[PDB]
Design a protein around this ligand. Sequence first.
Ligand code: FMN
Ligand code: FMN
Lengths: 117, 117
Amino acid sequence: ADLRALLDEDEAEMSVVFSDPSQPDNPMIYVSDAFLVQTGYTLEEVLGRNARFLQGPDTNPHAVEAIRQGLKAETRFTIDILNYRKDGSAFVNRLRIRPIYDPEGNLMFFAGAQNPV
Amino acid sequence: ADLRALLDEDEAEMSVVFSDPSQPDNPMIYVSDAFLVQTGYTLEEVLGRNARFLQGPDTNPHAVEAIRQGLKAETRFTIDILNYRKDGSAFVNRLRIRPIYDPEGNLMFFAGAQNPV
Ligand SMILES: Cc1cc2nc3c(=O)[nH]c(=O)nc-3n(C[C@H](O)[C@H](O)[C@H](O)COP(=O)(O)O)c2cc1C
Ligand SMILES: Cc1cc2nc3c(=O)[nH]c(=O)nc-3n(C[C@H](O)[C@H](O)[C@H](O)COP(=O)(O)O)c2cc1C
């Protein structure tokens, strides 16, 4: 069950995760294999968790709060945020987030794509 | 966002709904257009509701309880149950339900297919 199949025909992204905002702490319910391999985590380490663990020692905490407010807004947004892989290595992530809507316009999931730049 | 894209390549079903068991009353979060058209409901009338409203005056209540227990079991099952469209017309539904799993084997959704027989 590849939830990337819910994204548009135009969009083709490797590292993608899907979260469920109706569950406590907005946990990830699906991650692509590219997400796992690029970060170095196993499924057991990430499923059911909020994606904020990609942050680390030099991440700007206001960038973190920006993402939280953007999610509350249920809109498309992109932000350059310093992130980290399981092994501690750092990268600038051009993080792209978009709400995924049901056919009636209700929020179903958030999709978020990781893009090292 | 067509959640039927999460089903297997081998399966091709028209009327399909997806429910979220982590939400109160296991509501439907996605219904195919075929489900809406065959039952005669609009999106507003079904999204966010448990699918038990396809039952009606002559439905066997033990068949209903069978489905509830089958869902608790998180397994594939099929049952012939008397169901009803929005206009009150009755049909025998060969209802097919299967759990939809995340890559780690955790339950994500239930998928249920309606098949008038
Ligand atoms: C689908 C999705 C993907 C996300 N991906 C990332 C990510 O790649 N990197 C990151 O730093 N935060 C990411 N976040 C943001 C965190 O999950 C979290 O919302 C953020 O840190 C703000 O909330 P907090 O202050 O409670 O941590 C993502 C959020 C969602 C919903
Ligand atoms: C994905 C899904 C599809 C379902 N489709 C039907 C259906 O087509 N007809 C039906 O009578 N019940 C259907 N059900 C069963 C009802 O939602 C409900 O679980 C059942 O009536 C037993 O629970 P209750 O005793 O609380 O009503 C479906 C359940 C799920 C999770």
